[PDB]
């Protein structure tokens, strides 16, 4: 049994989304009491009036908010027998693999949340290899919908292709029967271009999710439902508690075949121009976040209706939809076939809250706890060791406490090619 120390490297992962995601580290002493939640305001939008005499028509002020929280640690608890040579040999490389897999988990979570809470939906009835320049059509459609909704894009924008569609775009470029700079680069290297159709970062991502086709058919809205932009409401005790601005619960005829991340659109309901409040030509698109009960769902953009009459003027100033729900309108699905998702977002749409685990405290005697920088992603965790003789072993645990948060689900998007059938 001759053996060597040269390791056969087998896998190599790349995590671009977790790099592009901004990381937030709020104070732990306050986060302990605030229940791991912290609230942020939302850019104010104001109403306006016309005319000279406007007595008793003075409005108030209304400033909305969102909440960012965090989940549970992500560990690599494993146990080390002190006599097994095959355990003595692989321990440090197991630590290295732990770091790599923790980073992979982080960026997979980022991708899944971005794909499952992206309100903007750009579908196509045919694949990206079908026509010429249809990859550019996808990227430009994403750019156009962002521009028309007048969303903030000051920090930047990003479009992540899956490898299938990246190769399709490269094929589209090299089939051009000419060779200048773009096709020559797409031939010599696979890269289509760094910027495409106004996006300043077009990348390929090896772990974008595949969005399963929904089984929903013939679902309609039960009752007219008007949603009102509020910053807080009274609870049962009279205490005023805050409201997330990124959710609305809609009561439908039947929520069967609807799951988290499905993309829907209500017939007749149209987008708005946000700031200017001018209707667009494109149906508003929503993403169902949670299917609560068997007749309710929770869609991530709140459908505030411009034509709504029960809204105060400062509340109407937040309308992102031309008309409300009408007790019969048909909610039609948008993902009607299985297809991997290309995902675009403005760089300020997703953040990564992170917290420390103070296991180095004097409370935890016997354990040795040190810090442990996760590479690739910009995160810190703990590395804790505690020996044992109830089994004559030792326990090693690498823990990481973070949480991804989509602060602007309306600035995230999903590109769905081949949405026929």
């Amino acid at each position: 049994t001759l053996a060597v120390d040269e390791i056969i490297e087998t896998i190599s992962a790349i995590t671009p989304m977790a790099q592009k995601a901004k990381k937030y580290t709020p104070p732990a002493a306050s986060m302990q009491r605030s229940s791991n939640t912290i609230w942020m305001p939302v850019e104010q939008e104001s109403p306006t009036q016309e005319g000279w005499d406007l007595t008793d028509k003075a409005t108030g002020l209304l400033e909305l908010n969102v909440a960012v929280n965090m989940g549970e640690p992500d560990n690599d608890f494993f146990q080390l027998r002190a006599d097994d040579l095959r355990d003595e040999t692989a321990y440090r490389r197991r630590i290295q693999s732990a770091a790599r897999k923790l980073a992979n988990n982080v960026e997979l979570k980022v991708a899944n949340m971005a794909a499952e809470m992206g309100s903007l939906v750009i579908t196509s009835p045919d694949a990206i290899g079908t026509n010429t320049a249809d990859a550019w059509n996808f990227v430009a459609d994403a750019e156009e919908i962002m521009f028309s909704r007048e969303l903030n894009r000051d920090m930047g924008t990003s479009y992540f292709f899956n490898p299938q569609d990246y190769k399709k775009a490269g094929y589209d470029l090299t089939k051009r029967d000419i060779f200048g700079r773009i096709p020559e680069e797409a031939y010599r290297d696979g890269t289509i271009q760094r910027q495409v159709a106004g996006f300043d970062d077009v990348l390929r991502s090896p772990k974008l999710p595949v969005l399963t086709k929904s089984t929903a058919t013939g679902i309609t809205v039960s009752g007219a439902q008007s949603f009102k932009p509020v910053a807080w409401q009274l609870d049962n005790d009279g205490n005023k508690v805050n409201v997330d601005n990124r959710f609305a619960t809609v009561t439908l005829s039947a929520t069967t075949g609807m799951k988290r991340g499905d993309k829907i659109s209500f017939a007749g309901v149209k987008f708005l121009g946000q700031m200017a409040k001018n209707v667009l030509a494109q149906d508003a698109t929503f993403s169902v976040v949670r299917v609560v009960d068997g007749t309710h769902v929770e869609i991530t953009p709140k459908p505030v209706a411009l034509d709504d009459v029960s809204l105060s003027p400062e509340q109407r100033a937040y309308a992102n939809v031309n008309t409300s729900l009408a007790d019969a309108m048909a909610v039609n699905i948008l993902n009607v076939k299985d297809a991997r998702t290309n995902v675009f977002w403005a760089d300020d749409a997703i953040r990564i809250v992170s917290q420390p685990i103070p296991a180095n405290h004097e409370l935890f005697a016997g354990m040795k706890t040190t810090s442990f920088s996760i590479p690739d992603v910009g995160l810190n965790g703990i590395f804790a060791t505690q020996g044992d003789i109830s089994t004559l072993s030792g326990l090693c645990r690498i823990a990481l406490w973070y949480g991804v948060n989509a602060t602007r689900p309306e600035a995230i998007g999903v590109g769905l090619p081949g949405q026929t059938a």
């Binding site: 049994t1 053996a3 060597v4 120390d5 040579l85 290295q96």
Partner: protein, 541 residues
Amino acid sequence: ENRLESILSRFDADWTASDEARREAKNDLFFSRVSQWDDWLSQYTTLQYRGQFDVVRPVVRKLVSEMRQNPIDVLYRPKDGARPDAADVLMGMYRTDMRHNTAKIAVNIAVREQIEAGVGAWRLVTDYEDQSPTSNNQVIRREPIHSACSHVIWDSNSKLMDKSDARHCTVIHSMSQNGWEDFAEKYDLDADDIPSFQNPNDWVFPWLTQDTIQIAEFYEVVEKKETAFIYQDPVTGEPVSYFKRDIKDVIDDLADSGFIKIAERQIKRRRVYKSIITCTAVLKDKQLIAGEHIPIVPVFGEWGFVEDKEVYEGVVRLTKDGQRLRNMIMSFNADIVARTPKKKPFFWPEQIAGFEHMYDGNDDYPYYLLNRTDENSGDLPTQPLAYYENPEVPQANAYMLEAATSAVKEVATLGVETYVFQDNLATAMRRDGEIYQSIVNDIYDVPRNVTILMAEVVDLATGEKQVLNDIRGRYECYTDVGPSFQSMKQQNRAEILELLGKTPQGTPEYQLLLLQYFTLLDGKGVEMMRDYANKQLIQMG
């Protein structure tokens, strides 16, 4: 016909030729630097104790200390019949650009590897320093080379210890990703195309990561008769300048300044070209470098040729057998001490049945009780008490531990003293002096000493660049070996004290004392003393 194929043919020939000695030297370095248990072919059997009991590291440390206490440097001396101060400028420039930490560290590294493995080397490079230049906005610095045995590969057909007759050398550079990025930035290469070459390292120790980006620098020397232009110096005499060195830059600026061509000759000289290569492509083709010699200086230990192949040895190659034997014997004896039953009595259970708390090691009882009777045999058989025999180290183990330690002690004695090793280092220093002098003639501004002063003859080109003009009266000084000083003032002080030591207390003794005060560093009291000594020397004529 392919340039890359010819270069690679040379490289493979030299690699194969040096295969044995390179591997032996790598093993010696591993033995004396990482671990003496070069057992990199392991097994999954239960772990066995493997201790390290060195008796060669103290000897290596003693030898490196002995060589460190005796620094050696280059000393330029005027030739026979030359001007008495022919080496002043060259020696000053050498002491100027070899006084930094890099030169000393490179020489120390080469010496330590010479002692341990058998061969070390260092390199001379030229750089553009715009702040503190030695001459012509340039400096010459000495850089180290680690693992010279595996990273510096010489011409296989070289039978000289200093490799002056080696006509091509290939140096292997290994780096990580950041190092490769910097190398590409520094040599104006493409950082996207990661290079590759023959890896000179083995993953024998568990190292997690090891650098894997390799490239090679192939230096070659070509000796040919090229054109030299005979001019007429506007001050006095006639200079000679090489046509290549003023081909287009100042070929007319010489005449415009006032030089008149007289003759055109053909002079034979050596030019050195460097190429940057990988295993598949040539990156830089034949970039001409400074000097007439390959800029790598090797240091050897015990060097020779057995039968058309080189062998170099240090102090460690001949102690590995005995040291491994000593480690093995001491490990076996440690095993004996640990995993062996102790000395305890042998009992039948019936002899001590009912009294087994009397034998557990307490001292609550004044004696030990036994059983005599049994109900079937009447009386227990009475046998003399027996104990497990004490652990013992076998005479074979003791004898061979002593013998292996004695053998290693006997072998690990370089010479009687490191005279031969210091002489080989002096050979390396003479070769380095040769190379440095040639590089100085190539890139520095070397003035000429006139008996009418110290005159420089130079001119600028139309692109504002200055091209040095050097006459062919350049090799006026040769290379000897002397102590290592940090400046010419230090060297002159040492010379004055050396003369003072042998001069009796006559008038020259007063002369040299005043001279020593004259060449002293500056405070305030020493300033007063130096002023007094200068005045006395001036007034004494």
